Amino acid sequence: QQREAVRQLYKGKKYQPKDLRAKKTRALRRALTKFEASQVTEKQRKKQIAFPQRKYAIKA
C-alpha cells in the first residue's frame, strides 16, 4: 500500500527515487535513449529527405 501511495505523489515529475526507478541493468541505465539515438544532425536530415532510399524492382 505504501509504495503505491508513494508513486502517485511522485508521479509525473523528474527525479523519483532510485529504488522506484527502472532496474533494467547497469548497461541499460546508461546507454543513450531512443530520442538520443534518433537525434540526427541537421545536414543529413536534409540529405535524408532529398534522397531517401527508394523502392524499386527489376522486371521490365
Binding site: 505504501q2 509504495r3 508513494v6 511522485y10 527525479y15 523519483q16 527515487p17 532510485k18 529504488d19 522506484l20
Partner: protein
C-alpha cells in the same frame, strides 16, 4: 594606493565559508522502513529447563531466550511492555548453542509465579 590588511599572524589558514545542508530533490529509499526490533521480535522464548524453575522461586527471576541483536535496555523495555512488570535488573549471557539467554529479576512487588501462569508454561 593600497591598504593591505594587517596580518599579525604569520600563518594563513583556510578561510571559513558557508556549508549548506542537503536539499534532496527526491527521497532516499522512498519508504521509511518499519521497526526491525519490536517487542515480539526481541523476546523469543522462555526457557523451561528445570534449573530455571529454581530461580523462579529462589530468585523471583524469569529467564528468556532473547534475540542476538538485542541488549539489556531493549530487554528491559520489551518485558515491561508485554507484561507490565517492573524489572529490577537484567543479566545476560550467550548460550554456546548460539542463543542469548537473559535472566530477568523482577522487582520486589511483583511475582514471577503469577506471570508464569499467565504466559502458559509452568
Amino acid at each position: 594606493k593600497k591598504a593591505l590588511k594587517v596580518r599579525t599572524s604569520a600563518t594563513f589558514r583556510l578561510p571559513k565559508t558557508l556549508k549548506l545542508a542537503r536539499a534532496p530533490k527526491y527521497a532516499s529509499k522512498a519508504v521509511p522502513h518499519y521497526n526491525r526490533l519490536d517487542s515480539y521480535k526481541v523476546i523469543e522464548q522462555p526457557i523451561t529447563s528445570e534449573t530455571a524453575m529454581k530461580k523462579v522461586e529462589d530468585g523471583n527471576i524469569l529467564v528468556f531466550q532473547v534475540s542476538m541483536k538485542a541488549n539489556k535496555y531493549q530487554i528491559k523495555k520489551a518485558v515491561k511492555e508485554l507484561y507490565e512488570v517492573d524489572v529490577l535488573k537484567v543479566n545476560t549471557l550467550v548460550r554456546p548453542n548460539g542463543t542469548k539467554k537473559a535472566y530477568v529479576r523482577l522487582t520486589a512487588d511483583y511475582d514471577a509465579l503469577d506471570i508464569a501462569n499467565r504466559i502458559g508454561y509452568i
